[model samples]
Target: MDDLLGLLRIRIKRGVNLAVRDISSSDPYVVVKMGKQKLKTRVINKDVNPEWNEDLTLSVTDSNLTVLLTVYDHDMFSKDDKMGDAEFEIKPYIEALRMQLDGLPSGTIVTTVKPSRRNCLAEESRVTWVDGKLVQDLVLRLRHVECGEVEAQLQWIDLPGSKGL
Candidate 1:
């Protein structure tokens, strides 16, 4: 297999804070919103290793969409104190690539529907909404809570490569 040119990286933090609506620069969180669906998330970057986690809501919009993994604060639960400060950015990160690949017209369609229940496992999963409609709640689940990674791939058939040719 050939290696991809680069990898996309996003920074996140762990710990409690005292406010649920404050955007702190240190503890960075990712808020990925497409159309009407939105995913508000936090990540735990293990300093001892290159491992991380996806946490919180993974919402989606009501349209065929793409996301640009930008900057945001990791603020949740309005009573915990800040766990010092932590931040990260993506250099051709996975999330950014997935967001870009989603925009491509692959044979399959990606939905924007958020999960209907509160689950920690869904934090690392990929979701898509069909027909510009959201069947789930505003709070989306991800794949992280399950100790997994959201790996999105694009595949298509090239007729020129067929054996019959």
Candidate 2:
């Protein structure tokens, strides 16, 4: 009851104006890291803006885990280049998943998070009751480089015998 809370699924949708690290265009890929788990998306060759639309899942035992996301350029027999990076915390989405929202209609917003100096939210983030489930759509603004943004979503799945918040 203390270890496993549930599973968190992250949907990496797309990127906007990602930094170009190569000639004319960049081979960009995304890396998701939470705790000790590291997952990556397929490299899109010669495109700064790419539609990854890849789903990644990570086991969640702690609610306060910081998920790190970074975009890098792939190379052949050379070191990869870092385009930009962004990070987000799952506590707000986790809290909204614990609510009783089954009867709510689709697109009902449950929680709203805005961009600030504390986090990497590029625009407003909202957790809504959609498609008979809870989902948080996030737009994370990349940092430490040129202009870039990442669009993704978070969903929670509960195991049959696992505990909940």
Assess candidate 2 and give its lDDT.
Answer: 0.91
Q: CA lDDT of 133 in candidate 2?
A: 86
Per-residue lDDT tens digits for candidate 1, residues 13-81, read 322221222343233444544345455554433221112254333222112334433333343544432
Which prediction has the highest TM-score against the true structure? 2
Flag regions of model 1 displaced more than 4 Å. 1-25, 43-51, 55-64, 75-165
Per-residue lDDT value at 7 in model 1 = 18
Q: Each candidate: what lDDT? A: 0.29, 0.91
Quote the lDDT for 80 in model 2: 95
The true-versus-predicted C-alpha distance at residue 134 of model 1, in Å, is: 23
Positional deviation of residue 57's Cα in model 1 after best superposition, in angstroms: 8.0
